[PDB]
């Protein structure tokens, strides 16, 4: 079980720095090269550089030379990526991707495992946790739809799960919309059997990491 | 007598394997054992006759089958790093209480096959000071950086294998002893008379049979797939 676990999302002001971490598990950490790849919202992929945790050897994209710094701590199997003098177009999800080549092999040039990503928003606006409201199943409910409304948060993202991960089928978590207040809003829905409404408990698990919000909202028929 | 295949095997965690065992002695009782340092021989399963099988001390993750009297396969359902051991098959008449053992299967289970490396082999020619001082000539062979520890070193003089004047280390050195995935080094010596080394018609070859991956195994590294192969090094006699 190779796993790469990255640090949580953040908002940083323009001119500030961010240090994104990536903790490796399930393999000898110094044996593989760790790359950093970014993707701006709705955009393609951009390689930033890499560190070889064994010898501290680095390579970097000239486009970030002077702002990017890759380090590692072998005691805690973590690789860091610090990016300085944050500009508005540095808003992106940042991924750590493991090179395939073990023990100095050239296969390091292609990536096998990736972290989940760390969204960094470059903004002078303040962090705000969301409000979570039930989208109650209809009395006139066959299949019934229910969900949760995650209103007024900044910055992105929020994660939403159902029944702690035990409910995945028929789930639709929608892309957030930016409201005129400069705040985000999203809904998460699930279509379930109408017959289950009386018996089965439905709880949405919302997480907004920039504000440390963790809400477990029970969704019931009125 | 008791036959076993393969002699060596490297597996990836989760893989399946069947160690074959067969005898032509009409023995009713066949058994499987594993041998680990510190521990002695531990019985895994036994069969008191065709169609009958029973659990030994360590049945955990092993299945056995006795469809015929001659064969007794040991199936490894899903290989785990704890199953790394030497396995021996054994057969008793079951009627003389004497037990005979198969040659053994040395098995290594690794989390990743990218840790498998063939040896590099080098021959070191006799020192002139040794030749003059003792009238003897010692050739040294090194097999380095191999994983797993599944190798067979032999010396060949003039196209024929030799055993006289040979000493190969009984166990390899761990290159990084602290590590569990450590690569190995092994040395051997071949000592001949100074005059035998001095004849340029004599050719000495040090051969290392390495057991590694199959030609059907998957491989994503830039380096060559570390398959079962012979790696050798040679030296020619010299009237220097």
């Amino acid at each position: 079980q190779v796993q790469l676990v990255q640090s949580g999302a953040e908002v940083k002001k323009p001119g500030a720095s961010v240090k994104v971490s990536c903790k490796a598990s399930g393999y000898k950490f110094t044996g593989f090269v760790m790359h950093w790849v970014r993707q701006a919202p709705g955009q393609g992929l951009e390689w930033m550089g890499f560190i070889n945790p064994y010898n501290d050897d680095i390579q970097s994209n000239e486009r970030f030379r002077g702002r990017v710094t890759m380090t590692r701590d072998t005691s805690i199997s973590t690789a860091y990526m610090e990016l300085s003098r944050l500009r508005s177009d540095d808003t992106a999800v940042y991924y750590c991707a493991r090179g395939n080549g073990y023990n100095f092999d050239g296969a390091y040039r292609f990536f096998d495992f990736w972290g989940q990503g760390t969204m960094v928003t470059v903004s002078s606006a303040s962090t705000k946790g969301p409000s979570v409201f039930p989208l109650a199943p209809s009395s006139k409910s066959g299949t019934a739809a229910l969900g949760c409304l995650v209103k007024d948060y900044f910055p992105e993202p929020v994660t939403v799960s159902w029944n702690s991960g035990a409910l995945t089928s028929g789930v639709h978590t929608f892309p957030a919309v930016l409201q005129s207040s400069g705040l985000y809003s999203l809904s998460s829905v699930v279509t379930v059997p109408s017959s289950s409404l009386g018996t089965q408990t439905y709880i949405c698990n919302v997480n907004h990491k920039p504000s440390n919000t963790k809400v477990d909202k029970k969704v019931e028929p009125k | 007598g008791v036959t076993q295949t393969p002699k060596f095997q490297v597996l990836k965690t989760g893989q399946s394997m069947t160690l074959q065992c067969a005898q032509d002695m009409n023995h009713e009782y066949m058994s499987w054992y594993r041998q680990d340092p510190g521990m002695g021989l531990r019985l895994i399963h036994y069969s008191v006759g065709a169609g009958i099988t029973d659990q030994g001390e360590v049945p955990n993750g092993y299945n056995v089958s006795r469809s015929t009297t001659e064969d007794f396969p040991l199936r490894l359902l899903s290989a785990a790093p704890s199953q790394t051991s030497v396995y021996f098959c054994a057969s008793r008449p079951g009627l003389r209480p004497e037990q005979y053992f198969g040659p053994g299967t040395r098995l290594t289970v690794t989390e990743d096959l990218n840790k498998v490396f063939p040896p590099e082999v080098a021959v070191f020619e006799p020192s002139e000071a040794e030749i003059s001082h003792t009238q003897k000539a010692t050739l040294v062979c090194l097999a380095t950086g191999f994983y797993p520890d599944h190798v067979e070193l032999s010396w060949w003089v003039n196209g024929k294998e030799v055993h006289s004047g040979v000493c190969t280390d009984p166990q390899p050195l761990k290159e990084q002893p602290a590590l569990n995935d450590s690569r190995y080094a092994l040395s051997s010596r071949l000592r001949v008379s100074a005059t035998f080394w001095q004849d340029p018609r004599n050719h000495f070859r040090c051969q290392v049979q390495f057991y590694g991956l199959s030609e059907n195994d998957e491989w994503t590294q830039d380096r060559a797939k570390p398959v079962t192969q012979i790696v050798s090094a040679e030296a020619w006699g010299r009237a220097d």
Binding site: - | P93, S164, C167, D169
Partner: protein
Amino acid sequence: EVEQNSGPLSVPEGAIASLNCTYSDRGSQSFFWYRQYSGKSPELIMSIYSNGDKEDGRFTAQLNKASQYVSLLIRDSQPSDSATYLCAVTTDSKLQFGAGTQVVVTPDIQNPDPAVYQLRDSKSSDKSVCLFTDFDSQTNVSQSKDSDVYITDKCVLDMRSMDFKSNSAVAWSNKSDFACANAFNNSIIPEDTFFPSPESS
């Protein structure tokens, strides 16, 4: 349960290697001795079924059913006999095996001439090994203290047609510091070890 004596037993060539073995089941009627060479399989060498002595070449097995005691003596020990000896016990036609006793028979070196030689790679002269050889069995080789210096334990070779036996240990390293003069520095070696000068360039 089968229990054997503490190993490795160091036995000089020509001497008797004495192996003991005790068992707990009093109804045991079959007792055996297996010889296992390193990286090889256990081979049955002796079987004893009733009290007293059983000889077979250089081996003598002894059984004392009353004391639940099995013995194996290896007379006129040869370095050839260096192996692990396993004691196995049973009651009827399972076999309980002991952990074994490793026996190391040290060769009788009557004419030692201890020296450290430098041998070069037949393919590349910059690569070399240090061979500590022709020392008597009083000398023990210590393992490497440094992690990038490799040292093998003493090995006995037999030049059979000449009836000549000799000990040797190999040492090698990529370290710029490494030299034949310092290779075996962690071992207590003879004061008169010959250290020939290497070939200069």
